[PDB]
């Protein structure tokens, strides 16, 4: 797997396969992941980053490297690590897709609002790249969604899903610990053959990360 950093070393992208890279940025010293989809109609991100600066840097980095424009982003919940760069997106005319609940929660947290255009299950298509978004229920937050690439059997778990190295659930101020297991099970039931899982924070793994998150919920 290839890994490209930015000049400061605050941002990395690292390849999962041909058209699918993870993005990782550091904010205040805490890492955060999303996806970069290289499609024939432009670059699509799953999630932005912690703030406007890092989001700008992210976009600059992937636009140069893949030689096409970021056209769309999928926002997976309304916390800073996911939605922090929303102003950069809107001012560039980058479409910020989300559920209606994530948009409200964005506004309530005082962020500019994403589109609120995703339903519980939405099937999108960008160039040849298929993408499903799924709301499995409450967990890390009320609104948290996952993203599924059916052509690659790749799941972006976001902050719903913990990495192997995580010993606890992290910040549960906005969580629903009792719904979180059922929500993970809903993911397991929909996506019965998974090649890789991208957690919101920490290293990429397989379905074990969902089972691991279950254990941490006990
Ligand atoms: Zn969060
Ligand atoms: Zn997070």
Instruction: Give Cα 217 distance to the centre of its chain.
Output: 21
Nearest ligand, CA 47: 2
Distance CA 194, CA 206 (A): 7
Tokens of 28: 């205040």
- Residues 88-104 as b/e (b if ≥16 CB within 10 A, e otherwise) read bbeeeebebbbbebbbb
Is residue 212 annotated as part of the catalytic site, yes or no? no
Marked catalytic residue, from 17, 109, 153, 171: 171
Q: Relative to the alpha carbon of 157, which ligand is closest? A: 2
Instruction: State which approach was used to obtain the coordinates.
Output: X-ray
Q: Which CATH class is domain 1-218?
A: alpha beta
Annotated binding residue 64 = no
23 annotated as ligand-binding: no
- Chain centroid offset of residue 143 CA: 13
Structure tokens, 130:
């298929």
d(CA 196, CA 15): 12
The 10 Å Cβ neighbour count of residue 65 is 14
SS (H, E, C) 1-27: CCEEECCCCCEEEEEEECCEEEEEEEE
Catalytic hit among 72, 81, 143, 174: 81
Q: Is 165 helix (H, G, I), strand (E, B) or coil?
A: coil
For residue 79, indicate whether it is catalytic. yes
Q: Half-sphere exposure of residue 56, counting CA atoms within 13 Å on the CB side? A: 6
Q: Long-range contacts made by residues 171-177, C-beta under 8 angstroms, separation at least 24?
A: 172/140, 174/79, 174/140, 174/141, 174/142, 175/139, 175/140, 175/141, 176/138, 176/139, 176/141, 176/142, 177/217
Q: What is the Cβ-side half-sphere exposure of residue 108, based on CA atoms within 13 angstroms?
A: 9
Pairing of strands 42-46, 70-74: parallel
Please give the resolution of this entry in Å, rounded to 1 decimal: 2.2
């Amino acid at each position: 797997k290839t890994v490209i950093k930015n000049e400061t070393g605050t941002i990395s992208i690292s390849q999962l396969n041909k058209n699918v890279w993870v993005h990782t940025e550091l904010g205040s010293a805490v890492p955060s992941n999303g996806l970069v989809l290289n499609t024939s109609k432009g670059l699509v991100l799953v999630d932005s980053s912690w703030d406007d600066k890092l989001t700008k840097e992210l976009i600059e980095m992937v636009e140069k490297k893949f030689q096409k424009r970021v056209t769309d982003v999928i926002i997976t919940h309304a916390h800073a690590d996911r939605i922090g760069g929303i102003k950069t997106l809107k001012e560039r005319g980058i479409k910020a897709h989300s559920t209606a609940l994530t948009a409200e929660l964005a506004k309530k947290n005082g962020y500019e609002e994403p589109l609120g255009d995703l339903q519980t299950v939405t099937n999108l298509k960008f160039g040849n790249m298929k993408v499903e978004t799924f709301y499995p229920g409450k967990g890390h937050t009320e609104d948290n969604i996952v993203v599924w690439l059916p052509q690659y059997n790749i799941l972006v778990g976001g902050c719903l899903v913990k990495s192997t190295s995580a010993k606890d659930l992290g910040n549960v101020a906005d969580a629903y610990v009792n719904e979180w297991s059922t929500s993970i099970e809903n993911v397991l039931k929909r996506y019965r053959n998974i090649n890789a899982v991208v957690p919101g924070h920490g290293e990429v793994g397989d379905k074990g990360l969902l089972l691991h998150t279950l254990d941490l919920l006990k």
